[PDB]
Amino acid sequence: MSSYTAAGRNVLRWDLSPEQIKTRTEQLIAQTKQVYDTVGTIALKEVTYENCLQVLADIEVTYIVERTMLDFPQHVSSDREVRAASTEADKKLSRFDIEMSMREDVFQRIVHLQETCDLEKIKPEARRYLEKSIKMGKRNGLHLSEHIRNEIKSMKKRMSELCIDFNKNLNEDDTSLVFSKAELGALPDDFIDSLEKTDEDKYKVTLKYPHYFPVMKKCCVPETRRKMEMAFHTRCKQENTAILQQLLPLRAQVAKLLGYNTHADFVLELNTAKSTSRVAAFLDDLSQKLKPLGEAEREFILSLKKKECEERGFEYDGKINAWDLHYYMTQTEELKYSVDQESLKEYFPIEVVTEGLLSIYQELLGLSFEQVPDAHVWNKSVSLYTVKDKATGEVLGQFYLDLYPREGKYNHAACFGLQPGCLLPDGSRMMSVAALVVNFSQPVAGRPSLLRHDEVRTYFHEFGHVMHQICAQTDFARFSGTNVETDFVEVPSQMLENWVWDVDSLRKLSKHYKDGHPITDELLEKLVASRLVNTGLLTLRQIVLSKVDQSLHTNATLDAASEYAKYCTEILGVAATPGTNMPATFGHLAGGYDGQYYGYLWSEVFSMDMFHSCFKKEGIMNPEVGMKYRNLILKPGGSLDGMDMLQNFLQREPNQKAFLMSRGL
Ligand SMILES: [Zn+2]
Numbered sequence: 001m002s003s004y005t006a007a008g009r010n011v012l013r014w015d016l017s018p019e020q021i022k023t024r025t026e027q028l029i030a031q032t033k034q035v036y037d038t039v040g041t042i043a044l045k046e047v048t049y050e051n052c053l054q055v056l057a058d059i060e061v062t063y064i065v066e067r068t069m070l071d072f073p074q075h076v077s078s079d080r081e082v083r084a085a086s087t088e089a090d091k092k093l094s095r096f097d098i099e100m101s102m103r104e105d106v107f108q109r110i111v112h113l114q115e116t117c118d119l120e121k122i123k124p125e126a127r128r129y130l131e132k133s134i135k136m137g138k139r140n141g142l143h144l145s146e147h148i149r150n151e152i153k154s155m156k157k158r159m160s161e162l163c164i165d166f167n168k169n170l171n172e173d174d175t176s177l178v179f180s181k182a183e184l185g186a187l188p189d190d191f192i193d194s195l196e197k198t199d200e201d202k203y204k205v206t207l208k209y210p211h212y213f214p215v216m217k218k219c220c221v222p223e224t225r226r227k228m229e230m231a232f233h234t235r236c237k238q239e240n241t242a243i244l245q246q247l248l249p250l251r252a253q254v255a256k257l258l259g260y261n262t263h264a265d266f267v268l269e270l271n272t273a274k275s276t277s278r279v280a281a282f283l284d285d286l287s288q289k290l291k292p293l294g295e296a297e298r299e300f301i302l303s304l305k306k307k308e309c310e311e312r313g314f315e316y317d318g319k320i321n322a323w324d325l326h327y328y329m330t331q332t333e334e335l336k337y338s339v340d341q342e343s344l345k346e347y348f349p350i351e352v353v354t355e356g357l358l359s360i361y362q363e364l365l366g367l368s369f370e371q372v373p374d375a376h377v378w379n380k381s382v383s384l385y386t387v388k389d390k391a392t393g394e395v396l397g398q399f400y401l402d403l404y405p406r407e408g409k410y411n412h413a414a415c416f417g418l419q420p421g422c423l424l425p426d427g428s429r430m431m432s433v434a435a436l437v438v439n440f441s442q443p444v445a446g447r448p449s450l451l452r453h454d455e456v457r458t459y460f461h462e463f464g465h466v467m468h469q470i471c472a473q474t475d476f477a478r479f480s481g482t483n484v485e486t487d488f489v490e491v492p493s494q495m496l497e498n499w500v501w502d503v504d505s506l507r508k509l510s511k512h513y514k515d516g517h518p519i520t521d522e523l524l525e526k527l528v529a530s531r532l533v534n535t536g537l538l539t540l541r542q543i544v545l546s547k548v549d550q551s552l553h554t555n556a557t558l559d560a561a562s563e564y565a566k567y568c569t570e571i572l573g574v575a576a577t578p579g580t581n582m583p584a585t586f587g588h589l590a591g592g593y594d595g596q597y598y599g600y601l602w603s604e605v606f607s608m609d610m611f612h613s614c615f616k617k618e619g620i621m622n623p624e625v626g627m628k629y630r631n632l633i634l635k636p637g638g639s640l641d642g643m644d645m646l647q648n649f650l651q652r653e654p655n656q657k658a659f660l661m662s663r664g665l
């Protein structure tokens, strides 16, 4: 199969039945184990590049591809049975993945290969493959005595149970509060109308996000915001505090047994940040540079509160409490740049946004997008596109667009890698495949689907991952697509969001759905000018969370709540409510990427450096810079370190000048 057609390069099945998913799962695991069994028994002196490295690499490709037909349906299939089977498949496959990574016999063979092998006779990416594989083995303790490995296991198995419990608690929580309409003042009728009513003249308000935020952002009754904030930040307090008290010390022990000083050092080693000290300095210096901006905003908010308390006689306490931050930050947006989102959206018909988004990217990256006519999909609402390189006709890959909310479908925005763009056994390249999964407002009444600006920003964000997935071309599957450092994966996505704050780009993405008139120059200037409203406190709040995250993985004997309170008053200027335990509701800690929360802010600094220093310098639609970004930042996927690719693109080490200049510092 050629690199100049898509024909036959994508045969992923999206209509598998629950029994077919079960069968394929059982067959994948067994057949794949046999390959590791075969590599794990090769005589150490007989280990070679073809019978070892090439064997492990070939199996990684075939395995990852079969695995996606099995673990993806749980996120998009409309059939409840199919979804459950996929979830089950993902559980068996995930346990199998752990098993294989714990194969001491296989580790031995790769360690010996790297020795007896002349690393200078093989491609740089294959050297990286070996080094990274051996490194992952050491990180799993495969070089340690059997006694120590067993200890690490009994601890990791207990840390998984703890994280699953921490999360289960928060998810199964159904705490509720009852308020009279008087107590929910200022809240929209659309909000109140959707609330359940009790046998009293009261409305039920849960603690789930859809209820919590509009109440913290719009409720003009201070005491209501107060009770919500108290109840919301006390969820699972006992249970999860108890879990954290066991979990963090466990993370410390495991790190020690592995040879690291702290769990943080363990996590950060695989990131571009590299170490605990580097992250601490990153966050510490940022909050210092941001301090003055936080003092002004905090001051501005204070003048708004004191003033409003007099115009309603609520009483003033001279301070910004936790249950006041969102509220006054919203008031700020309405006074600085009154941007009516429900009005603006009318200028963003999904049809127009989609066409615009794709047009921009085709021109910027030298690509051509063509929709697949009668494409095999998991839902009639999904469209499939084939991606060719404008110049050569080369088919880089395909991407699916799943844009509307649907029962059973993943409810958050994301980009899934379905097929890696790596080499196949005969040297031919596997076509990359990605699925963009978002949930944009569907067409209501006679009006088409209309996107708010933040949704247009999400569309671009996710499409940034799609392009990373599709343009990434490596020799090995493990370095393909978005397999870059965790604190680097959000670089491609956040850099592309800059385009939705670009006047000229916005013109290409909007047209009033009715008469089709463009957005007024006056409104455009206002929209882009409001990009940084409240950036001070917002960023400081992100730094607070980032510090808590590092702290809980640098220590152990630490009280999560007090640590959070400490940074809240020291960095944010808004005290943490006495009696609450935000960290115990911090889903990021347990499951996920603990010790890496700073990653998002870390990535913004870099994306901002590239956008300003390169695209702004040369013109953000300049094809030359566009191609360099694709070739130097996207194309290599994870086959090169993040900082090296940044250097390659910038032609100097990255720095935060741009990130600070934008913020206005
Ligand atoms: Zn021991």
Ligand SMILES: [Zn+2]
Pocket: 461, 465, 489, 490, 493
């Ligand atoms: Zn992202």
